[PDB]
Design a protein around this ligand. Structure first.
Ligand SMILES: *[C@@H]1O[C@H](CO)[C@@H](O[C@@H]2O[C@H](CO)[C@@H](O)[C@H](O)[C@H]2NC(C)=O)[C@H](O)[C@H]1NC(C)=O
Ligand SMILES: *[C@@H]1O[C@H](CO)[C@@H](O[C@@H]2O[C@H](CO)[C@@H](O)[C@H](O)[C@H]2NC(C)=O)[C@H](O)[C@H]1NC(C)=O
Ligand SMILES: *[C@@H]1O[C@H](CO)[C@@H](O[C@@H]2O[C@H](CO)[C@@H](O)[C@H](O)[C@H]2NC(C)=O)[C@H](O)[C@H]1NC(C)=O
Ligand SMILES: *[C@@H]1O[C@H](CO)[C@@H](O[C@@H]2O[C@H](CO)[C@@H](O)[C@H](O)[C@H]2NC(C)=O)[C@H](O)[C@H]1NC(C)=O
Ligand SMILES: *[C@@H]1O[C@H](CO)[C@@H](O[C@@H]2O[C@H](CO)[C@@H](O)[C@H](O)[C@H]2NC(C)=O)[C@H](O)[C@H]1NC(C)=O
Lengths: 90, 105, 50
């Protein structure tokens, strides 16, 4: 452990401070997307942002709007699957 | 990767044991409040924007590029049409100008 | 003192409201990188014995 001339110095950034950076980060990219990472944040409704990102890959914007319900469902059931993979898999 | 913002250009400069680069980038500023709508309903058809987003100034509707405010009339040749009016949540009732029709008179 | 992480401003998110830039500023940032060191050399025998 540490008993004869050895020690460990504490980190500068505590756990709650890092979790405050990561909360600010993913609370930005929901409200403003890539924008907030260039200049001032710009509030854009989320669904419009996702539709744009679809255009960014090469699928016509209307695809997102027509299928919005299925997309949201798949997203949610995927987050829950990750939650359980981590909650059980050693 | 090469300076904050949207990379536009760069120039290298020398240094005794290194290289210093000047990265010239574009940064937006002075942004306003607009109301939006995913798509428009006109005569039963959904009119999605091509390059940009439909934005409302309270009492009028336009279409503009997402990088810089430049309003234009929502017309048949800047918006594509697909599906029906009642399908996507969030449409608004508006009109679309058809440049051809003034020519038939 | 306890360090501050920065300003605390919340974005007025809505589901029918967008913010759009109406101007722009080009800015020239700088970046610095080393790419070399002094090409040193030492004579091992002279160093030890001379
Ligand atoms: C968009 O409109 C809102 C309100 O119409 C503007 O409002 C303020 O932003 C601050 C930022 O924290 C909030 O605390 C206020 O509640 C907002 N509303 C007020 C003061 O009435 C906002 O600035 C506008 N944004 C753009 C980019 O135009
Ligand atoms: C929204 O935009 C429209 C179009 O620019 C504005 O209507 C104009 O108002 C000016 C000021 O009186 C008139 O000179 C123009 O003739 C109008 N446009 C036309 C040709 O219809 C409207 O006032 C704006 N309103 C808001 C709240 O932004
Ligand atoms: C965006 O959000 C607003 C407010 O949360 C939603 O407005 C609610 O919509 C229901 C159904 O039409 C109304 O009964 C409520 O009165 C509305 N609330 C307010 C405060 O106006 C709106 O439906 C959401 N979706 C949009 C605008 O597409
Ligand atoms: C968009 O326009 C349509 C057409 O007028 C609206 O549907 C009408 O709604 C009124 C009010 O209940 C009815 O009296 C009419 O019978 C409807 N017309 C048809 C042909 O269905 C619709 O409500 C409008 N929607 C918006 C958001 O403006
Ligand atoms: C964008 O911001 C720049 C920053 O100043 C604005 O520039 C000035 O505009 C005023 C208008 O009266 C001129 O008198 C000044 O000479 C401009 N400054 C410079 C650097 O020459 C510019 O006007 C803004 N954009 C718009 C559309 O107003």
């Amino acid at each position: 452990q540490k008993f004869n001339g050895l020690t460990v110095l504490p980190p500068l950034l505590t756990d709650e401070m890092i979790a405050q950076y990561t909360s600010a980060l993913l609370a930005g990219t929901i409200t403003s997307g890539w924008t907030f990472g260039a200049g001032a944040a710009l509030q854009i409704p989320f669904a419009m942002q996702m539709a744009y990102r679809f255009n960014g890959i090469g699928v016509t914007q209307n695809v997102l709007y027509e299928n919005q319900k299925l997309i949201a469902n798949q997203f949610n059931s995927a987050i829950g699957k990750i939650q359980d993979s981590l909650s059980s898999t050693a | 990767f090469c300076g904050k913002g949207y990379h536009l250009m760069s120039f290298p400069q020398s240094a005794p044991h290194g290289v210093v680069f000047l990265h010239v980038t574009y940064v937006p500023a002075q942004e306003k409040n607009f109301t939006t709508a995913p798509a428009i309903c006109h005569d039963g058809k959904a009119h999605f924007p091509r390059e940009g987003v439909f934005v409302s100034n309270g009492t009028h509707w336009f279409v503009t590029q997402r990088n810089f405010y430049e309003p234009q009339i929502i017309t048949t040749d800047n918006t594509f049409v697909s599906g029906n009016c009642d399908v996507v949540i969030g449409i608004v009732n508006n009109t679309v100008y058809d440049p051809l029709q003034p020519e038939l008179d | 003192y306890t360090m501050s992480l920065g300003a605390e401003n919340s974005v007025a998110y809505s589901n029918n409201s967008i913010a759009i830039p109406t101007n722009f500023t080009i800015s020239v940032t700088t970046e610095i990188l080393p790419v070399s060191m002094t090409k040193t050399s030492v004579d091992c025998t002279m160093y030890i014995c001379g």
